[PDB]
Each structure stands twice: as structure tokens, then as C-alpha cells.
Scaffold this active site. Sequence first.
Site, PDB file in Angstrom:
ATOM      1  N   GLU A 149       0.848  -1.227   0.000  1.00 40.85           N
ATOM      2  CA  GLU A 149       0.000   0.000   0.000  1.00 40.85           C
ATOM      3  C   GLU A 149       0.866   1.253   0.000  1.00 40.85           C
ATOM      4  O   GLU A 149       0.859   2.025   0.959  1.00 40.85           O
ATOM      5  CB  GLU A 149      -0.978  -0.027   1.170  1.00 40.85           C
ATOM      6  CG  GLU A 149      -1.847  -1.279   1.093  1.00 40.85           C
ATOM      7  CD  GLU A 149      -2.951  -1.386   2.122  1.00 40.85           C
ATOM      8  OE1 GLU A 149      -2.910  -0.606   3.114  1.00 40.85           O
ATOM      9  OE2 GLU A 149      -3.842  -2.245   1.932  1.00 40.85           O
ATOM     10  N   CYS A 156      -9.388  -8.810   3.083  1.00 43.80           N
ATOM     11  CA  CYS A 156      -9.832  -8.813   4.479  1.00 43.80           C
ATOM     12  C   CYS A 156     -11.227  -8.205   4.625  1.00 43.80           C
ATOM     13  O   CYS A 156     -11.644  -7.280   3.882  1.00 43.80           O
ATOM     14  CB  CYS A 156      -8.857  -8.102   5.414  1.00 43.80           C
ATOM     15  SG  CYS A 156      -9.048  -6.307   5.393  1.00 43.80           S
ATOM     16  N   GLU A 216      -3.824  -9.577  -0.974  1.00 46.11           N
ATOM     17  CA  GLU A 216      -4.380  -9.331   0.338  1.00 46.11           C
ATOM     18  C   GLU A 216      -5.897  -9.177   0.223  1.00 46.11           C
ATOM     19  O   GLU A 216      -6.412  -8.437  -0.608  1.00 46.11           O
ATOM     20  CB  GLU A 216      -3.711  -8.118   0.977  1.00 46.11           C
ATOM     21  CG  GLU A 216      -3.785  -8.106   2.502  1.00 46.11           C
ATOM     22  CD  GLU A 216      -3.096  -6.935   3.209  1.00 46.11           C
ATOM     23  OE1 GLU A 216      -1.815  -6.844   3.121  1.00 46.11           O
ATOM     24  OE2 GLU A 216      -3.820  -6.097   3.858  1.00 46.11           O
ATOM     25  N   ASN A 265     -12.629 -12.071  -8.925  1.00 48.28           N
ATOM     26  CA  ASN A 265     -11.220 -12.035  -9.244  1.00 48.28           C
ATOM     27  C   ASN A 265     -10.889 -12.973 -10.402  1.00 48.28           C
ATOM     28  O   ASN A 265     -10.094 -12.631 -11.241  1.00 48.28           O
ATOM     29  CB  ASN A 265     -10.345 -12.440  -8.063  1.00 48.28           C
ATOM     30  CG  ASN A 265      -9.925 -11.230  -7.271  1.00 48.28           C
ATOM     31  OD1 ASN A 265      -8.865 -10.661  -7.529  1.00 48.28           O
ATOM     32  ND2 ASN A 265     -10.760 -10.846  -6.315  1.00 48.28           N
TER      33      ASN A 265
END
Length: 497
Positions: free
Chosen positions: A235, A342, A340, A370
Amino acid sequence: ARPCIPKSFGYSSVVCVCNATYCDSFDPPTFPALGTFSRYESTRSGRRMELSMGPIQANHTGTGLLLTLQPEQKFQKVKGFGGAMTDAAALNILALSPPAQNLLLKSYFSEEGIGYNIIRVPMASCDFSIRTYTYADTPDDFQLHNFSLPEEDTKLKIPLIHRALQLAQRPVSLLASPWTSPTWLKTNGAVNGKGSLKGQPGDIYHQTWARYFVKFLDAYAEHKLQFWAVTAENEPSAGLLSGYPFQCLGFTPEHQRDFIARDLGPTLANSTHHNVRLLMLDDQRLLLPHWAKVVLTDPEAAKYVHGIAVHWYLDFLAPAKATLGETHRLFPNTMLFASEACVGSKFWEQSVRLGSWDRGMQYSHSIITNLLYHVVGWTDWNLALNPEGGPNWVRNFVDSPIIVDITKDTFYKQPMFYHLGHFSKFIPEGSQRVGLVASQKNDLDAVALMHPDGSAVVVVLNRSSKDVPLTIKDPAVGFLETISPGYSIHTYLWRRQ
Ligand SMILES: *[C@@H]1O[C@H](CO)[C@@H](O[C@@H]2O[C@H](CO)[C@@H](O)[C@H](O)[C@H]2NC(C)=O)[C@H](O)[C@H]1NC(C)=O
Ligand SMILES: Cc1cccc(C)c1OC[C@H](C)N
Ligand SMILES: [K+]
Ligand SMILES: [K+]
């Protein structure tokens, strides 16, 4: 062999209870004989990857819904599925008793489990850490003479990582990502807060930052661990925000572009680790396509980037087509990878919800979306967390597929765990997504792939409350009559002749 022990905590579905003497497990995987399909079913009502088997039929008649496999219509090849061995993952896991710890790793990494083949390793400390540290805290050590690994590495992560590898029959690929540099390389001199590397790509700070990546790989190589890939920064847009509360390092895309071209790529190219892939971005999908446009149009940077890592916060809405779909269109040779994911990140939200079907449904829908937009891989965040969604040193709690209860020596397999395993177990590395056409408008979500050995896998997700009867046609092989119950997920497998 062993079914789910369900407990409820007053959310929509159940968790499976594991401990020192019992965990849910599958037998050694077999395929059904030709003529026969396998169906794994999980439901909100409690079913957990329960195997059933059906005939593959020659003819079909109906008006009903028909999904027709497009086995010769080929998209991406799949790299795999995994999660992250963060400090907190490591700590949760090792707070369990040897036997429970071992059944937890079995759960993820073994063929009696759900067959993870990826582990993401933070390079030193992140928010899911209890100390702030880097590998190179002594100030002005530009040659990294004092670089080294502390116990977080040598005692928790590295040992657990070797243990997960012993349990897996699949080859397992490690992915590294750093959150911050040593503070003495940064404009603001702190692990967090707004700030980036000092100076300019090409200079001492940038070369030192890139030599840190090599030391990192050198040090894990001492412990006999090789990496498949590294990201250029976790990030990078975070480090550009004032107040940013935890470990970060800010790059504009121009900055990441230049750093890759002048320092990191070249530095990596001239090490023993020249075969480690380099992934860019490793941030949220709404930064695409602009970031790739900045980075990959530069030829000096472009020649070093193997793929683009994307982050999913499943609490939040964002377009898929205009971001992943657009990026694939502009850059079809560069692979897309989800590094990642979450759920429960929103401060106002229960971090851990034991039994949430909804958050399981969120994980599956995301993997499917995805896969439909050319992403070759999906990596969950923390492998294990406590019942608070910790530990986290800035109280940044989130959910996890596995929740450890140290006081009772117990751990809980969330719906998430199963939603992810509906993929991870049944799609090995080198699977290719193939096409799938629905004969009519419908409320399901589905994806189809072909195994390295030509076997078929289709996953169907029903987010609706109603039982949808349906048929899957394999043109070469026959028909599968089935149903998709309200609030279910199924994975179908069969041999193709
Ligand atoms: C681990 O969990 C299992 C399952 O909850 C426990 O075994 C159960 O024990 C209860 C009480 O004696 C019985 O009602 C069940 O018949 C048992 N189930 C099975 C499958 O054996 C077990 O005692 C727990 N172990 C520890 C060490 O806490
Ligand atoms: C289940 C399915 C399989 C293949 C193709 C399509 C469009 C499809 O529907 C997705 C739609 C969101 N309900
Ligand atoms: K050190
Ligand atoms: K939260």
C-alpha cells in the site's frame, strides 16, 4: 475422515470447533471414476464440504437453467491460494498446544486440509505486530552491516513456515512485502505518518532500500527458504496520507516507477535472487489502471515488473471492470494477482463474527469476481487471529478464517475458511480458467476451470435465499443435473473424456 463439530455464537451460521484431540478433516483426495461427478456442499444451515456423488448423463431435456462449459475458451493460468504469516498469525498459532497447532496448519496446508500453496511474509513489522521494528534500526548503516533477523522471524515465522511446507504435498510459494523502511531512510523519520524515502531514485537512500530487499532474501536463504515473488511496497499510497497510523512508506506511481527502474529491479537482477518475480502496486484496485499506465509505459521500469498485486477490502464497494478489466485490456501480458483480502476492517464493525455466513459469501464472491477478471491468485490476510481480531498494536482489528481461543485451547474454522477452501482445495497451480455460458438470467455466481491433467472444476455460489435447480453441460462428456440451494456453495469435479 472427520466431520465438523458445529458451535453457534449467535450469528447466521456455525463455526467448526477444533482442539487438541479433534479437527474436521478430509480423506486422501480421489477423483470419481469416469461417468461419475463429485460435489462438495457447504450451507448456512450447517453443511461443511460434505462430499456427494452423481452420475454424468448422456442426454438432458428441460426448460431449466443450463450452464455449458466452454473448455476450449481459455483464460489465465492460476498461481494459487494462500494467506499471510504475519507476526500476530504466528503468535496466535504458537499460543496453542503443539497438537492443536499442528491440526491448524494441517487445516490450511495439507491434502486432509484445504491445500494452500501461498504464504505472504511481511518484511519486518506491520500493524499485525506487537513491536515496531525493521531489520536495520541502527541509524546510518547504509551498507547494512548491522542488518539481521530478530526472533519474530527466527523463532515464530520461519519455523511455522518450514512446518507448513512439511505438511503440504503441493509446492508452496512464498511472497514477501515490506510496510516501512528504517526510519533513518525516511523524510518524516518515523515508521508511520506521512513520509517516503529521502532523496531521489538512484541515490544512496534508494540503493540502500533496494539492498535491504536483497539482505532480506539472503537472510531467509540462510534458513533455507526461497521466495517466488516480492512486492515493491505494501500500500504505497498509504505513506502519502497525513496521520497514517501504522508502518508505511509512500510512493506516487512516478516514484515507484523510478525506484523500480533505477534501483530495485537492477539490484535484484544482479543478485542470486534474479529469479524472484517483482510485483508492483500491492494496493487497492481503484488505483488501476492509472498506476500501471504510469509504471508499465516506461520501458526501463516495465522490463522488471512481472505482475501487479491488488488488495481487496471486502467491506467496501469498488468497480471490477473499469479497474482489473481495463488493466488487463491495456496490459494483457502482465499478470494480475490478489495479494491481500480482508473483511471486518471497518472500525464500527464487529472485527470477529463467529459463524458469519455473510462474510463467507463475501470471500467466495470476491474470489469468483477475481477469477473472472484474469487474476491468477488470491491471498488472504492473517492466517489466524484472536477473538478480538488481534493482536494489532494500533487496535486495527479485522476478521480471519481461523479464530484462536487460547484459554480453551480451541480454534474455530469460520465460514470464510470453507468458502476459500471451495477454491483452494480443488484448483491446483497451473489450472486454467475456462468459460462458462448461462442459458438464462439467474442469481448465481459461478466459475469454471480445467486442471493441469484436464479434469473439470466448477464452483457455484448461491447468495440468494432460493433453491435454484440447474444443469451443467460438458459438451465432450455429458450433463450434471443438480441444484444450488439458497445460501450454499458447491464445488463440482469430474474426469473429462
Ligand atoms: C475436543 O473436542 C471434542 C469434540 O467437542 C471433545 O470430544 C467430545 O466430548 C464430549 C464430552 O465428553 C462428548 O459429548 C463427545 O462425545 C466427544 N466427541 C468426540 C468426537 O469425541 C473432546 O473432549 C475435546 N478435547 C479436549 C482436550 O478438550
Ligand atoms: C452463474 C453464471 C455462470 C456463467 C455466466 C453467467 C453470466 C452467470 O451468471 C452470473 C450472474 C451474476 N448471475
Ligand atoms: K537488526
Ligand atoms: K473492526
